[PDB]
Amino acid sequence: GFNLKVKDLNGSARGLTQAFAIGELKNQLSVGALQLPLQFTRTFSASMTSELLWEVGKGNIDPVMYARLFFQYAQAGGALSVDELVNQFTEYHQSTACNPEIWRKLTAYITGSSNRAIKADAVGKVPPTAILEQLRTLAPSEHELFHHITTDFVCHVLSPLGFILPDAAYVYRVGRTATYPNFYALVDCVRASDLRRMLTALSSVDSKMLQATFKAKGALAPALISQHLANAATTAFERSRGNFDANAVVSSVLTILGRLWSPSTPKELDPSARLRNTNGIDQLRSNLALFIAYQDMVKQRGRAEVIFSDEELSSTIIPWFIEAMSEVSPFKLRPINETTSYIGQTSAIDHMGQPSHVVVYEDWQFAKEITAFTPVKLANNSNQRFLDVEPGISDRMSATLAPIGNTFAVSAFVKNRTAVYEAVSQRGTVNSNGAEMTLGFPSVVERDYALDRDPMVAIAALRTGIVDESLEARASNDLKRSMFNYYAAVMHYAVAHNPEVVVSEHQGVAAEQGSLYLVWNVRTELRIPVGYNAIEGGSIRTPEPLEAIAYNKPIQPSEVLQAKVLDLANHTTSIHIWPWHEASTEFAYEDAYSVTIRNKRYTAEVKEFELLGLGQRRERVRILKPTVAHAIIQMWYSWFVEDDRTLAAARRTSRDDAEKLAIDGRRMQNAVTLLRKIEMIGTTGIGASAVHLAQSRIVDQMAGRGLIDDSSDLHVGINRHRIRIWAGLAVLQMMGLLSRSEAEALTKVLGDSNALGMVVA
Amino acid sequence: GFNLKVKDLNGSARGLTQAFAIGELKNQLSVGALQLPLQFTRTFSASMTSELLWEVGKGNIDPVMYARLFFQYAQAGGALSVDELVNQFTEYHQSTACNPEIWRKLTAYITGSSNRAIKADAVGKVPPTAILEQLRTLAPSEHELFHHITTDFVCHVLSPLGFILPDAAYVYRVGRTATYPNFYALVDCVRASDLRRMLTALSSVDSKMLQATFKAKGALAPALISQHLANAATTAFERSRGNFDANAVVSSVLTILGRLWSPSTPKELDPSARLRNTNGIDQLRSNLALFIAYQDMVKQRGRAEVIFSDEELSSTIIPWFIEAMSEVSPFKLRPINETTSYIGQTSAIDHMGQPSHVVVYEDWQFAKEITAFTPVKLANNSNQRFLDVEPGISDRMSATLAPIGNTFAVSAFVKNRTAVYEAVSQRGTVNSNGAEMTLGFPSVVERDYALDRDPMVAIAALRTGIVDESLEARASNDLKRSMFNYYAAVMHYAVAHNPEVVVSEHQGVAAEQGSLYLVWNVRTELRIPVGYNAIEGGSIRTPEPLEAIAYNKPIQPSEVLQAKVLDLANHTTSIHIWPWHEASTEFAYEDAYSVTIRNKRYTAEVKEFELLGLGQRRERVRILKPTVAHAIIQMWYSWFVEDDRTLAAARRTSRDDAEKLAIDGRRMQNAVTLLRKIEMIGTTGIGASAVHLAQSRIVDQMAGRGLIDDSSDLHVGINRHRIRIWAGLAVLQMMGLLSRSEAEALTKVLGDSNALGMVVA
């Protein structure tokens, strides 16, 4: 997790200001009043968890399926924007009519030189993909994907009444995707919708051509409708010359929505009553995270009012459509009440009783089991591979994670984190300007870390507010998405609490008063200073969502919070291949234990191995790291290094002996935290394996030199706890979770303190 | 437990110096060399645990039985010395021959005016005790005891062939007694032996008179042997005019033993080869705790050489006998090897590796169950009472103590106490002159606290060395015995380790060179400074036993260590009465819980009650407090207040910020100690009762005022742990253990720190 001050926050982390999204640049705080009331449809969203595997290649074909696939592909960062995927796709099937030969040759597969026409059909369907790999020689395909696409028309079932088999399909694993959207994500949505406008007609045409085909004869003679097949689809491809223009339409519905927001009356911003109605927008005004997307792209690209729309006809064609009313996005529009709620609340009491520890937190049970893949490549001799799930490290390590599936529950974490509770004297005097604002989400880490980037750098970029901006455009991307997902998540969750919101320019640089933020209100909070407001008027009135967050009364989490976890043995006997890599290849790696007693080096040196007790190596497998399982413990890692370096900065600053007592107790209580945690980690059964076996090895080392064979001399007290960590080290790296540069940290922190048991055991 | 410095100790606690026993008065350290080699019979001792109930009144009669009873009586402090009991006893049966009427009247019970003689015997034996209570009107008996004694002669069985029944006996509960002896204890022994010289003849005479009695007739006619009965016993009472003189004989065998010790050759101190032999003394020289008794009474009364002995004949009559060869003492002579061993060892390591934490400790499982008495007084309408054991608070509280019978095992205590381990920086630098000398015994507390005095005052008197000497002669007594039992225990245990010892005057005030101490030696210790010696010569050479203690290698405890625990339901259907009181009368007492939330006083106020769930009051019972069960936790209490006030004195003295860090971690780790201890105490089933029920009561208090009835508002986090202590409070007072003026301390210490969970939970 992670925390801020309650009074200050901009001096703690600029990223959660509305102002930073507004690009206010650290200076003046937003406050400007003169307000317009709102309401909630609790706003459009995504899913949150959707780990599943589509079938393709079975010849059913449905654009909504592929839309997810390309969308996920960009979410894999396989190229970049979906829009790029699409323009490059059209660049691909600019091999459109310039290649009649696609028909002439696939029909040649139908056998062929079909001027020798007849009810020729016999058998063969399901792998034109290879003869179409010859079509890849005809249609080179640096991407696997569209090459894997085009097969379908000839072989969805065509000719639907024979050809014939498949008895086989294909594969891909969509994972859960991004939680909340943005400019690029949206244009990717509507772009995916132009593709939606593509493929469905592309199926329907053939769907009727087949009706007009088997005139009988039987399937009738070729070099015709077959030789047709998709020429009409090419015309359908030419029906696709003009959907819209994604950035323009998105910017359009955007800024017109903003005009619907802004106080600014005049003709530049006068949403016509001629069209203030007309469906959709009437609830679409209510969406609010979508509104965050507004202020976001308003932040990046100014406003750039192309206003492709008129005032009414047609201010209709442009908002004919948008992403939620697309199914093309994994993301989906959202009903009324729950918003996206699933976080409880508690708050510190000094019997006064203003909070000093805000408690806002997670809600999430991590995977109970994970399974290794055996990369049995054989077909194609390239990317094509089979994984064949089988038990291995799997079952046993999983059962060992079950206790971790208890003792590292988030509820227990925050509950202990809440137990930090009493601090700076007593009791009853803990208050002093700011107060800690602890928080964190399952999502931001589960995704940004899934991209393999280490979220904490972005987190710190938020903490300083200002972007490091030295990153690769890829990392530039992960940073951006990190930002608006943090921010917006906090926004619309905070919104999920407080019922009412009002629009607020800002002013400052105006830059034409279109720039704007929000201010909120609640009353129940006790007459105490809190944030800039205090509470002022018996009511909040704050720009800043965190402020409304702090005042909220304690509650409970709602969502099923489960990791759901994938399975695939079915699809595995089916596979085939897909962009899978990221796992990656060789399931684990050794870590080397060491210790000294009687002033002698020993170095236990253990692998990897199954370690569990059946050799050897194994080999080969690789298991996926759960995003979640490492993400959560990384939240805590962020806490560890947080209290470490920051309160060490306190060790540097306030040299007051009482403040000395504070840094003492706090750093040494995170110390007792990881202490007792690894402590319970050592009792784990694999931990038991590491204990007995590594101890067996170094006892064998005792037998090395003949005089230090004088029985065990390690065991007294300190050594046991001292090696107890080693169990937490196997549980660390190559348990499939922690990423090293970690035990590193833990080592230094375990050096920071006396540790000991500290008692128990 | 309790601790000292390793280098210093006289500046830490003078009481464990040999010198304090020598009355050196703080100044010069003993060291004087010129030495005489010794050996061990591992020395005479006592038992250590002997909780059992003698039968009397059944008419068997055996002086060895009564010897224990009087001895225990003085150990109850019922009067004072056993010698006092005996001289006052003879003062009692100075009603000896001046009362022929005891015969004339008991025979009158035989019916009587026996000049009307015949084989009169019919029936009636077993309660002359009441008609002898009329003899108490004849022989007033401020003590119950001798009155309860004299009955026996007429009614051991006399006349042995009728009279007749008893079908009933009597009672007394001997407990375990003092571990090790001293001057007064010894003279009490030999005095008990003159009583031994008394009663056995007192039985034997009648034992033959009966043989010469029932001449038949049948039992023959009275006013004769009956009228005789004990006149010969009075002559036997007159055989008892002169055993010896206890103080003189004890002083004799004493100082002659000392002459056997001292280097001083000349005629005043030249143990005759004429009698250096002659049994007993040949192994008696080897006894060494007995030798502590030597240096002790040599300390109190100078030497005062009456030398009732000559040089040989008879230097025999005086050591004809002594206490171990008496059975009169509960104490008993001891064989070869074990001495009285039952303590393990460990020591702190800095990989150098001199100890910084000596670990010397206990070994003792406390009672698993205890049972209340119902004081059903009815007979005599005075001291006479029946207890009738029945289940009550008993069974259930006991089962609740079973977890305490796990989590407050001494082994776990010292093991956590050993975990204090790392301290003052790292690692590897913990060393700095002195080092903690943690220690304590089951015995000293189990007994001195059994006397109801609070041992810790005596402990502190030892810590300062110098006696407070303001105590009542009773308390003067408990102080003395506390001293020599501590001291000697440590002595002969330390002796139980090191094989060899040599005699050492001292010198100083000489006072005639008879004053003397001991110096010891071991070699294995590493070349490091330790105590005054360092190690000097590759060998120890120290006067002071603790020094030899510290160097010893780690080991394990041996003894059965069990509390054995009394039972009595049998004897209960039998009882009768004995000096029982001390329990005392009404089994328990209420403690009042209180808490504030929403700024309102609540005050849970709970009794007592069974509390367990069946009323009411009950009443009446009283249960014995185990000596042990409270004694041990009192050891820890001594530790609590120890680290508290002493390291608080460190808070006063060394204001160094690092030393600030040290006082921080140590005081706050005792804090975490009692924290986690009461923490696990709260999960106890009676603790569960206190939780749910007191919570039920204050929730009922919520229903008091109608608006604070707004459901529970206590439960968040801090309150639960905050009331978790209350379970440890019921477990405290009137669990039958802790004595209050205790939670007092705990309260202040729980105020000392943040506490919190500190985590968990």
Alpha carbon of A16: minimum distance to chain B alpha carbons (Å): 28
Tallying the residues shown for chain B, one arrives at 761
Do B661 and A664 make contact, defined as CB atoms within 8 angstroms? yes
Q: Does A657 contact B657 at a Cβ distance shorter than 8 Å?
A: yes
Cβ of A419 and B758 within 8 Å? yes
CB A583 within 8 A of CB A700: no
| A13 contacts: CB under 8 Å, gap ≥ 6 | A4, A462, A463, A464, A465
Is A665's CB within 8 Å of B664's CB?
yes
Cβ-based burial of B21 (10 A; exposed 0-12, middle 13-18, buried ≥19):
buried
Task: Using the Cα atoms of residue A714, residue A717, residue A722 and residue A723 in order, give the sign of their dihedral.
Answer: positive
- Cβ neighbors of B358 (< 8 A, separation 6 or more) are B3, B6, B347, B435, B436, B437, B438, B439, B549, B550
User: Shortest CB distance from A758 goes to which of B419, B721, B755?
Assistant: B419
Interface test with A, best of B356, B414, B421, B425 (most A CBs within 10 A): B421
DSSP code, position B332: B
Tell me the chain A residues in contact with residue B664 when contact means C-beta distances shorter than 8 Å.
661, 664-665
Residues of B in contact with A349 (CB under 8 A): 716, 718
β-partners of residue A519 are A502
Q: How many CB atoms lie within 10 A of CB A158?
A: 25
Residues of B in contact with A421 (CB under 8 A): 717-718, 754, 756
What contacts B593, CB < 8 A, 6 or more positions away? B603, B604, B605, B606, B694, B698, B723, B726, B729
Nearest CA in chain B to A424: B754
B421·A718 Cβ contact <8 A: yes
Nearest to A660 by CA among B565, B183, B651, B568: B651
Q: Which letter does DSSP use for residue A367 in this model?
A: P
Enumerate long-range contacts of B448-455, CB under 8 Å, 24 or more apart: B448/B478, B448/B481, B448/B482, B448/B485, B449/B627, B449/B630, B449/B631, B449/B634, B450/B175, B450/B627, B450/B631, B451/B77, B451/B478, B452/B582, B453/B478, B454/B739, B455/B482, B455/B631, B455/B634, B455/B638
Q: Compute the count of residue pairs across chains A and B with CB atoms less than 8 Å apart.
A: 92
Q: Which of B276, B265, B266 shows the shortest CA–CA distance to B315?
A: B276
Q: Which letter does DSSP use for residue B759 in this model?
A: -
Q: Closest Cα partner for B328 from B98, B582, B64?
A: B64
Look at B554 and A676 and tell me if their CB atoms are within 8 Å: no
The two structure tokens encoding residue A469: 């901006």
Q: Which residue has the tokens 């005019």?
A: B241
Best CA proximity match to A89, nearest among A214, A212, A188: A188
The reported resolution of this PDB entry, expressed in Å, is 4.8
State the smallest CA–CA distance between residue B758 and chain A in angstroms.
7
Task: Work out the number of other CB atoms within 10 angstroms of the CB of residue A687.
Answer: 22
Phi-psi region of B440 (alpha: psi -120 to 50; beta: other; left: phi over 0): left
In chain B, what is the straight-line distance between the N-terminal and C-terminal CA atoms, in Å? 29
**How are strands ordered across the β-sheet holding A36-37?**
A36-37, A501-504, A517-520
State the Cα torsion A751-A752-A756-A758 to the nearest 10°: -150
Sequence-ordered alpha helix ranges (H) in A341-438: 393-407, 410-418
Measured CA distances, A518 to A534, A541, A549, B722 (Å): 18, 10, 14, 42
Using CB atoms, which residue from A661, A676, A758 is nearest to B669?
Answer: A758
CA distance B592 to B729: 10
> A502 has which bridge partners?
A37, A519
Q: Please report residues of B whose CB lies closer than 8 A to that of A751.
A: 426
Q: From CA B285, how far away is CA B289, in angstroms rounded?
A: 11
CB contact under 8 A, A596 and B756: no
In angstroms, the separation between the Cα of residue A10 and the nearest Cα of chain B is 30
Amino acid at A685: G
Angle, helices B657-681/B743-752, rounded to nearest 10 degrees: 130
Q: Verify whether the Cβ–Cβ distance A717 to B415 is below 8 Å.
A: yes
Contact A620, A586 (CB under 8 A): yes
Tell me how close the Cα of A346 comes to any Cα of chain B, in angstroms.
Answer: 7
Q: How far is the alpha carbon of A717 from chain B, nearest alpha carbon, in Å?
A: 7
Contact yes or no for B156/B261 (Cβ under 8 A): no
Please tell me the distance in Å from B405's CA to the nearest CA on chain A. 17
Phi first, then psi, for residue A36 (nearest 5°) are: -115, 120
Q: How far is B670 from chain A (nearest CA, A)?
A: 10
Residue A672: its chain B contacts at CB < 8 A? 672, 758-759
Contacting A with CB below 8 Å, chain B residues are: 346, 349, 351, 415-416, 418-423, 426, 554, 596-597, 599, 657, 660-661, 664-665, 668-669, 672-673, 676, 716-718, 721, 751, 754-760
Instruction: Residue A152: name the closest of A215, A100, A88, A205 by CA.
Output: A205
Task: Check B420 against A597: CB less than 8 A apart.
Answer: no
Q: Which approach determined this entry?
A: cryo-EM
User: From the list B421, B673, B760, which residue is nearest A717 (CB)?
Assistant: B421
Backbone φ and ψ for B386, nearest 5 degrees, come out as -115, 150
- Smallest Cβ distance to A421: which of B423, B657, B717? B717
CB crowding B468-506: b at 16 or more within 10 Å, else e: eeebeeebebbbbbbbbbbbbbbbbbbbbbbeebebbbb
Q: What is the DSSP string of A453-512?
A: S-HHHHHHHHHS-S----S-HHHHHHHHHHHHHHHHHHHHHHHHH---EEEE---SS-TT
Task: Determine whether the interchain pair B426/A751 forms a contact, defined as Cβ–Cβ distance below 8 Å.
Answer: yes
Q: Please enumerate in sequence order all residues whose Cβ is within 8 A of that of A119, keeping only pairs 6 or more positions apart, or say none.
A: A217, A218, A219, A220, A221
Using omega within 30 degrees of 0 as the cis cutoff, is the peptide bond preceding B584 cis?
A: yes
Q: Per the CB < 8 Å rule, is B421 touching A672?
A: no
- Mutation choice for A interface testing from B716, B750, B753 by most A CBs within 10 A: B716
Calculate how close chain A gets to B497, using CA atoms only, in Å. 21
Distance (Å, whole) CA B243 – CA A44? 109
The CB-side HSE value for A730 (13 A sphere, CA atoms) comes to 32
Which of B425, B756, B760 is most worth mutating to test chain A (most A CB atoms within 10 A of its CB)? Answer: B756
Answer whether A754 sits within 8 Å of B346, measured CB to CB.
no
Write the single-letter amino acid at B53: L
Q: Say whether A759 and B673 touch across the interface (CB within 8 A).
A: yes
* Among chain A residues, CA nearest to B425: A754
| Cross-chain Cβ contact A421/B751 below 8 Å | no
Residues on chain B touching A758 (C-beta within 8 angstroms):
419, 669, 672
CA dihedral B197, B203, B206, B207 (to 10 degrees): -120
User: Which residues, at least 6 apart from A305, have a Cβ–Cβ distance to it below 8 Å?
Assistant: A255, A268
CA pair distance B269, B288, nearest whole angstrom: 20
All residues at 6 or more sequence positions from B744 whose CB lies less than 8 Å from its CB, including other chains: none
Chain B partners within 8 Å of A554 (Cβ): 716
The residues of A whose Cβ lies within 8 A of any Cβ of B are 346, 349, 351, 415-416, 418-423, 426, 554, 596-597, 599, 657, 660-661, 664-665, 668-669, 672-673, 676, 716-718, 751, 754-760
The DSSP 8-state label assigned to residue B318 in this structure reads G
Angstroms from A496 CA to nearest CA on chain B: 23
DSSP secondary structure string for all residues of A537-579: TTS--BS-HHHHHHHSPP----S--B------HHHHHH----S
Distance CA B71, CA B81 (A): 9
CB contact under 8 A, B426 and A760: no
A415:B717 CB<8 A = yes
